[PDB]
Amino acid sequence: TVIKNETGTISISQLNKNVWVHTELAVPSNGLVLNTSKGLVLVDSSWDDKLTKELIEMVEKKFQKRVTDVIITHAHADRIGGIKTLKERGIKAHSTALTAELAKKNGYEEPLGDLQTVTNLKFGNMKVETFYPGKGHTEDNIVVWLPQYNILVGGCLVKSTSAKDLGNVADAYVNEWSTSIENVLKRYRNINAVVPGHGEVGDKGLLLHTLDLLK
Ligand SMILES: O=C(O)[C@@H]1CS[C@H]2CS[C@H](CS)N21
Ligand SMILES: [K+]
Ligand SMILES: [Zn+2]
């Protein structure tokens, strides 16, 4: 189930053979780790370089292969904070153009801007779809879908059950957010699990929960 770095800093818990969640801390942030035959792939980095370096260290050691790619889901620090570490180790950082621009705007190094509204990738082995459903928690927020496992990384668009309000809405679009959630509920009709950007893993109800927090 759950391995852990020396300090409290970091944890990784399994969902299936090839798919784990990574969580880092005062506030917990989540992403995914995908074990493929061609390398490790992360959905999202972490808060800052130190922690992203530690996360990369822990998964390379444990799975005995390299992190080759990361998918960045939006341009806030918890997503993009370890971008310097990625870029300089030759780790590919995929994102939409929008997310790339917003990163350069907030003074981060740029990810690739290679992702479109729908983009289907494959690593091995592992199939990944990225979907941009519209504006919500940020302007640029995308979700990630694993069709082989019907698994959705909702990111910071999607709130956990324990979450009782919308968090920081300074960069949010609270009218479009409901529509973009629906756009996800429409696109992906059978969901086995949903990973929120912050908090505990759940299912389709996290999305209805978020819908409810927007009323
Ligand atoms: O607005 C939120 O819910 C989250 C968690 S706490 C707050 C500040 S950091 C992170 C950027 S996604 N954000
Ligand atoms: K398949
Ligand atoms: Zn955010």
Ligand SMILES: [Zn+2]
């Ligand atoms: Zn976040």
